[PDB]
Swiss-Prot record, chains A, B:
Organism: Severe acute respiratory syndrome coronavirus 2 (2019-nCoV)
Reaction equation(s) it catalyzes: TSAVLQ-|-SGFRK-NH2 and SGVTFQ-|-GKFKK the two peptides corresponding to the two self-cleavage sites of the SARS 3C-like proteinase are the two most reactive peptide substrates. The enzyme exhibits a strong preference for substrates containing Gln at P1 position and Leu at P2 position
UniProt-recorded name of the protein: 3C-like proteinase nsp5
Outcome (variant: residue 90 to R): In strain: Beta/B.1.351
Organism domain of life: Viruses
Length: 304, 304
């Protein structure tokens, strides 16, 4: 028993973190095979960040301007290209610690682990979700850019996020490893505001299943609901509308606990309308939406 | 900006996790140099767990009964001793991935990362504290025993916890790596109940500093207090009494924010007496006590 906000083990990704320096800017890169991935804004002066033309800024850059350091050993840059908002620096040496890996673009509501790095040195690991507004709620100081988010499928690391931007509201924006930003965000120091941070309904329900499974059951009630009735309450409370697909995804947890998804919806409804009344569920005083159904099954079954 | 519940990177500890099988029982071991550490209850049948005499049970065990498997490679056990509540199995091969390390017995209120393992395979990582009642609030299914808790001081892993016991209330008990349990707990399936789970006052104050530092300031008020006045309120709310030592420890965070520790105490006091009124601090609806002052400084400065 016990249910905790759990990151994947960081080992396989630690061995992929390098320091990238361009001019006076130092941030983090991902070394997979003979390529280092990093945010293209490594080339910018704070001045440039206001309205940078990245193609033009890049012309003033050669392979030898990108200083790449794996721990205390320098890597020879033999090539550099811009893919969308990332730089791919070709090095002469393939990372000997490259795991099996994919680049995956995750949907909002999907969760991943972030290995926060400074100067290509890992400092910590924590679990995130891609918010429905395409922000993430990270911990990123200066030097943390190029820190990546990932899932591990046993041995295969699916890289889903590279950190680029802090919005003035202290939320975080970044790219998949093909350099495409999540949501409407850009590597420009401009007026960019996050949209509504909606709650990931399916994730809250998963976490309610997780709680029942771990003995926190006080919020089970006698009521059921429909998708249409439940969604009226979702709407009012800035929750993602719940689909039959979400219901299907919660099936396995339904099965295990013998609680119909819609009964659990009715529990969530009451919790939204009435709050917690100063009570806690899995040591939390609000409704956690950064566990997927998959995260719950994983941690409640014990997959490695 | 951003402040998240952050575990140390797991890499250095992943390379220390092995599977230990004795008879039908499989759990996790820590391989440092030519020694594998594991909970002595690996030798018990569920039957034995009711009133085991570990010295006597051990006599029926030889080196060759302890099957030790690092990934897919078996280790030859050439020795086995009981230290308190741990077994130390001497293997013929020193772990090539042994980091610099210490064994440290942590005080309650001190935080550490747990690498949850099943069959010596890491599944996830999460941050904990040693609770003032000497429980921890983990995520541990069957097979998770021998999972360890640790701090990293740059390159030196301080191992502070090995997981042994789930109490029927779903909280967790274990040993330092010398085999001595935290608190009054024993490796016996008996009536063991956790004492009062008091809140770690100094940790809540650190986390209040962390919030100010990250722009969550609504709970700053016009009031100050004394240790003696504040402690009256602590008492009533099952908070650790605050000492001058706690105040001294919060000095650096005081300095940085220019908020006197006692003013921040007065903020905590109001929060205790009045609650949150449905507001959140660093995305939390209750007062977080599993960040130390040291954890806050680390994550707010960006140490690796
Ligand atoms: C996130 C990160 O590590 N990063 C982005 C900001 C950058 C900086 O301080 N500025 C504004 C200049 C472009 C140097 C440092 C790298
Ligand atoms: C925690 C763990 O992995 N562990 C302790 C319980 C044990 C078990 O299932 N029992 C009760 C018997 C002693 C086999 C498995 C190992």
């Amino acid at each position: 028993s016990g249910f905790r906000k759990m990151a994947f083990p960081s080992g396989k990704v630690e061995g992929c973190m390098v320091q990238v320096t361009c001019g006076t800017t130092t941030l983090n890169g991902l070394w997979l095979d003979d390529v280092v991935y990093c945010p293209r804004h490594v080339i910018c002066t704070s001045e440039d960040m206001l309205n940078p033309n990245y193609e033009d800024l890049l012309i003033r850059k050669s392979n030898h301007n990108f200083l790449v350091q794996a721990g205390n050993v320098q890597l020879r840059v033999i090539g550099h290209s811009m893919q969308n908002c990332v730089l791919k620096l070709k090095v002469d040496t393939a990372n000997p610690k490259t795991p099996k890996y994919k680049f995956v673009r995750i949907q909002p509501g999907q969760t991943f682990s972030v290995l926060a790095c400074y100067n290509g040195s890992p400092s910590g690991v924590y679990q995130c979700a891609m918010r429905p507004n395409f922000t993430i709620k990270g911990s990123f100081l200066n030097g943390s850019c190029g820190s990546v988010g990932f899932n591990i499928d046993y041995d295969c690391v699916s890289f889903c996020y590279m950190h680029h931007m802090e919005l003035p509201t202290g939320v975080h924006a970044g790219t998949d490893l093909e350099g495409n930003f999540y949501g409407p965000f850009v590597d420009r120091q401009t007026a960019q505001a996050a949209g509504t941070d909606t709650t990931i309904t399916v994730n809250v329900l998963a976490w309610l299943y997780a709680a029942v499974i771990n003995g926190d059951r006080w919020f089970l009630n006698r009521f059921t609901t429909t998708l249409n009735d439940f969604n009226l309450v979702a709407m009012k409370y800035n929750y993602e509308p719940l689909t039959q697909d979400h219901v299907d995804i919660l099936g396995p947890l339904s099965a295990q606990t013998g609680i119909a998804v819609l009964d659990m919806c009715a529990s969530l409804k009451e919790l939204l309308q009435n709050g917690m009344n100063g009570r806690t569920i899995l040591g939390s005083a609000l409704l956690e939406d950064e566990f997927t159904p998959f995260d719950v099954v994983r941690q409640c079954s014990g997959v490695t």
